[PDB]
């Protein structure tokens, strides 16, 4: 579960390099179930401002499938640790900026990936009545 920019929703799909899917949420090749999304111009977008919603766009290299990128260390173009607000040591996490008065592609979408794995256990998460005196087949539980 994650709330994104609409431009990031096509960046949550197999293939689909993007910018956000480079550093935040890497998309696999085959290990991919469903992608469901809907719009939260009422919840995750407030017309006056709510900036609990930030994203990271600077990290030394891309990711691996379903990697969870949490840790907040500021980014430098040649390492060698910074002392912010020194120059070329940027904040990685900047605000979304999606309000209720925005358009269509810039209202933040609730996107959930249903990641499907095939039979590394018996099947867990998935999806008539009887007739008398008639020769039938069965199947009970």
């Amino acid at each position: 579960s994650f709330v994104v920019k609409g431009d990031d929703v096509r960046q949550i799909a197999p293939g689909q390099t993007g910018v956000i899917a480079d550093y935040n949420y890497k998309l696999p090749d085959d290990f991919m179930g469903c992608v469901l999304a809907w719009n939260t111009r009422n919840i995750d977008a407030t017309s006056t401002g709510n900036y609990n919603y930030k994203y990271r766009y600077l990290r030394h290299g891309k990711l691996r499938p379903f990697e969870r990128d949490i840790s907040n260390v500021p980014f430098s173009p040649d390492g060698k640790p910074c002392t912010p607000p020194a120059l070329n040591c940027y904040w990685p996490l900047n605000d979304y900026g999606f309000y209720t008065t925005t358009g269509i592609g810039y209202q933040p979408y609730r996107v959930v990936v249903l990641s499907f794995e095939l039979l590394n256990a018996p099947a867990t998460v998935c999806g008539t009545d009887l007739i008398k005196n008639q020769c039938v087949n069965f199947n009970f539980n």
Binding site: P77, D78, N88, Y90, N94, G97, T101, G103, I104, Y106
Partner: protein, 597 residues
């Protein structure tokens, strides 16, 4: 690692940080434009100062980056627009003094008012009250009194602030290594180092003069005809070989001339081109105007308006407690929030103005994928010209036949054709000598071709020489009639309307090139063919990533501005102009005046 990767990094940090801050600044601007209250103007200056200080404080990180290391143009034009300081680079005293005098002029021109000589109670501002009486009154003394009182009450207050304006503003031009503030207007089209797509600054003076020499005979015949009709509607006032009195030109300064049409209708016994009464007959509101305009945008191939446009913009005039200004302006906010501030009446002019501002917003939605300070035109002129494209194509009878007004058997005698040509030609032609003269005059004042005590003299004498316009009463050096215009008092150059009027008929020929147009340039509607929309779209979204020369080549196949499209637009009308005024004099004499006789 390299300089250009961290330049891209700082610029994309600047995009994702400047998006939100400019959005807050233009939200505060929008809350002022939909609600004038002092809480809204205290909203309007917090985030706007937090944008102007943002460009400067991040220019202090942008000017540390050496600009002449990047071979590319795409991020180099990005770094140019940040390393321009804006207007914040002078001494600490003179910077705030010039910006304070600009705010003082912006107050006193916009809120000043005039009062009746026998009655110091009958007092009203510029718009409305004056400019509508300056458009329709048959009284000489009323229009003359309004004309002179507006220049005497606030223009005399705007002259010493213009005296300090020229010195401190040319001092800003010197502190940013420009020639004059005229060179600041010549450095808006300043593309550099492309070698085949470049443009120099004095070449703007070159182009303006060399393509205004093709305006001068057409304007000479048109000035003769409107002098004939002004001697008709205002008898015994105007010399037959002379210029025009400055309070008869439809507006205050002689800029727009369409309000002469009720007194310069050529053939009045023929059916009217003004469809205002037809818009009255079906009881229209602003909503059907904007939606039918949007359907015209769909028919030319440009997409619908999104949800924010109809959920957020104001489209009528409130009147009540939430009162606000109603000038139709297009707003880039980013975040998919592109708006029009427009209080619309049921008018053909408001219909074409709906087309105009929605053409601007469609242009904005086209370049909405650009980087954020390149979320703007390639230059200043393509915005206004692309906006005028939809209104000029929509004003043809080929589109009025298609609206649902003007029941679909509309004749094609040359009569209403020539009437439409002359009515459009009043505005389109008569704005250009005032543009030429106003811009060249301010170029002379800032350059120094005029001494600082000969401004008002050379102003009205070049209105006589170029625009053929006389003031009816003499002005001393206490006045400043240019500074008592909007764009001189509120920081806008005026040659963008000249470039508008040239690229307008350039884009007219180019968008009629693809839709298989048959007649001459006047009857051409760009509607119902979307290949013209595609050809306009492959300049509509480029922004300042590519110059105006490259996109202008991709549109018309030329690289220098040309007005021969306007001349072939007006040439049958030009033969009509040569035809009618054979019992008149074609020209104007600059020694005539209503105060010189």
């Amino acid at each position: 690692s390299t300089i250009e990767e961290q330049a891209k990094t700082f610029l994309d940090k600047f995009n994702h940080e400047a998006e939100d801050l400019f959005y807050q600044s233009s939200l505060a601007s929008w809350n002022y434009n939909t609600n004038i209250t002092e809480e809204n103007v205290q909203n309007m200056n917090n985030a706007g100062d937090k944008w102007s200080a943002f460009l400067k404080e991040q220019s202090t990180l942008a000017q540390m980056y050496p600009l002449q290391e990047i071979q590319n143009l795409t991020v180099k034009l990005q770094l140019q627009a940040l390393q321009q300081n804006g207007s914040s680079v002078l001494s600490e005293d003179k910077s705030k003094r010039l910006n304070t005098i600009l705010n003082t002029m912006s107050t006193i021109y916009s809120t000043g008012k005039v009062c009746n000589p026998d009655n110091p109670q009958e007092c009203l501002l510029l718009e409305p009250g004056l400019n509508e009486i300056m458009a329709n009154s048959l009284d000489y003394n009323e229009r003359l009194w309004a004309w002179e009182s507006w220049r005497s009450e606030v223009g005399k207050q705007l002259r010493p602030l213009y005296e300090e304006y020229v010195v401190l503003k040319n001092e800003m031009a010197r502190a940013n290594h420009y020639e004059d503030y005229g060179d600041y207007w010549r450095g808006d089209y300043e593309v550099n180092g492309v070698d085949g797509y470049d443009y120099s600054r004095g070449q703007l003076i070159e182009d303006v003069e060399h393509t205004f020499e093709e305006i001068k005979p057409l304007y000479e015949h048109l000035h003769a005809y409107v002098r004939a009709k002004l001697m008709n509607a205002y008898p015994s006032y105007i010399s037959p070989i002379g210029c025009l009195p400055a309070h008869l030109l439809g507006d205050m300064w002689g800029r727009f001339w369409t309000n002469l049409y009720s007194l310069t209708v050529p053939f009045g016994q023929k059916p009217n081109i003004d469809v205002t009464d037809a818009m009255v007959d079906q009881a229209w509101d602003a909503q059907r105007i904007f939606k039918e305009a949007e359907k015209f945008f769909v028919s030319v191939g440009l997409p619908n308006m999104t949800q924010g446009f109809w959920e957020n913009s104001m489209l009528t005039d409130p009147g009540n407690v939430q009162k606000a200004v109603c000038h139709p302006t297009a707003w880039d906010l980013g975040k998919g929030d592109f708006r029009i501030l427009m209080c619309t009446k049921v008018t053909m002019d408001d219909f074409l103005t709906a087309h105009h501002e929605m053409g601007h917003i469609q242009y904005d939605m086209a370049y909405a994928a650009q980087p954020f300070l390149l979320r703007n035109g390639a230059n200043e002129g393509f915005h206004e010209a692309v906006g005028e494209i939809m209104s000029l194509s929509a004003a043809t009878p080929k589109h009025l036949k298609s609206i649902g007004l003007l029941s679909p058997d509309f004749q094609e005698d040359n009569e209403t054709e020539i009437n439409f040509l002359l009515k459009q030609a009043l505005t389109i032609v008569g704005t250009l000598p005032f543009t030429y003269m106003l811009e060249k005059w301010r170029w002379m004042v800032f350059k120094g071709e005029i001494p600082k005590d000969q401004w008002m003299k050379k102003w009205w004498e070049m209105k006589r020489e170029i625009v053929g316009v006389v003031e009816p009463v003499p002005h001393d050096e206490t006045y400043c009639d240019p500074a008592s215009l909007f764009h001189v008092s509120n920081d806008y150059s005026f040659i963008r309307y000249y470039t508008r009027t040239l690229y307008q008929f350039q884009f007219q020929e180019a968008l009629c090139q693809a839709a298989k147009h048959e007649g001459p340039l006047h009857k051409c509607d760009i509607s119902n063919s979307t290949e013209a929309g595609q050809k306009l779209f492959n300049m509509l979204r480029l922004g300042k990533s590519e110059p105006w020369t490259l996109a202008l080549e991709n549109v018309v196949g030329a690289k220098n501005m040309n007005v021969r499209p306007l001349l072939n637009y007006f040439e049958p009308l030009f033969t009509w102009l040569k035809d009618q005024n054979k019992n008149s004099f074609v020209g104007w004499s600059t020694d005539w005046s209503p105060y010189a006789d």
